From a paper:
Our five structures were solved from crystals grown under two different conditions: (1) 20% (w/v) PEG2000 MME and (2) 0.1 M Tris pH 8.5, 0.01 M NiCl2, 20% (w/v) PEG2000 MME. Structures 4 and 5 were solved from the second condition and cryoprotectants for these two structures were glycerol and ethylglycol, respectively. Unfortunately, the structure of the linker could not be defined, because following crystal structure refinement, no electron density for the linker was observed (from Ser154 to end), indicating that the linker is highly flexible. In structures 4 and 5, the electron density of residues from Ser154 to the C-terminus was not visible, suggesting greater flexibility from this segment. In structures 1–3, the N terminal tail (Gln9 to Ile12) forms a rigid loop, whereas in structures 4 and 5, the N terminal tail (Gln9 to Ile12) forms a small β-strand F0. In structures 4 and 5, Ni2+ formed a complex with Asp25 and His38, His147 from another Gal-8N molecule, along with three water molecules. Asp25 is close to β-strand S1, and coordination between Asp25 and Ni2+ may impact on S1. Therefore, S1 may induce Gln9 to Ile12 to form a β-strand from Ile12 to Phe19 via van der Waals forces. If the N-terminal tail interacts with the linker, then Gln9 to Ile12 forms a rigid loop and part of the linker (here is from Ser154 to Gln158) is stabilized. In contrast, if the N-terminal tail cannot interact with the linker for some reason (e.g., due to the Ni2+ ion mentioned above), then Gln9 to Ile12 forms a β-strand with the linker having high flexibility. In our P43212 structure, glycerol also could not replace lactose.
Residue numbers in the entry: 4 to 153
Amino acid sequence: SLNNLQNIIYNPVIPFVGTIPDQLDPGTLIVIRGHVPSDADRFQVDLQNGSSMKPRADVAFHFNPRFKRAGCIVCNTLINEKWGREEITYDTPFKREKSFEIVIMVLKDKFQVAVNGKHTLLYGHRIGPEKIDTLGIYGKVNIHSIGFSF
Ligand SMILES: OC[C@H]1O[C@@H](O[C@H]2[C@H](O)[C@@H](O)[C@H](O)O[C@@H]2CO)[C@H](O)[C@@H](O)[C@H]1O
Ligand code: NA
Ligand code: NI
């Protein structure tokens, strides 16, 4: 249910980096609506510990749709500017020139991600979700809205 969803941020310029307005406790939703442009090779939604660039902030949850060949979604965690073990989901619901609604649900033990009303993937927590205070969106993607349900 998307009641309690409050959209902030409309049509942000990409790259977008913004502070998350509350702690990502179990039951929290992050809802991102947009489109993949026709020339898209990849984009990413990063749940970050801070917004530092040098050194690069840790990414607790890197959610990275890629579109070359059959496409996929790579999920991973960045710590001390080093990527961890990749979790690759090959059944991607993203397609160039198609719209999407990403819903990231924060559970106690994992993120549960649904795209356009259909379950997409799970990703177990590698960093405590309380350390997540920043949402980054990078790459070839168009964003209409970003909202949260706490
Ligand atoms: O793990 C996410 C991370 O991947 C990097 O690229 C990987 C690539 O996904 C992997 O299949 C290949 O074998 O090695 C590369 C390691 O650099 C990206 O450069 C980075 O942006 C992240 O998306
Ligand atoms: Na990256
Ligand atoms: Ni549109």
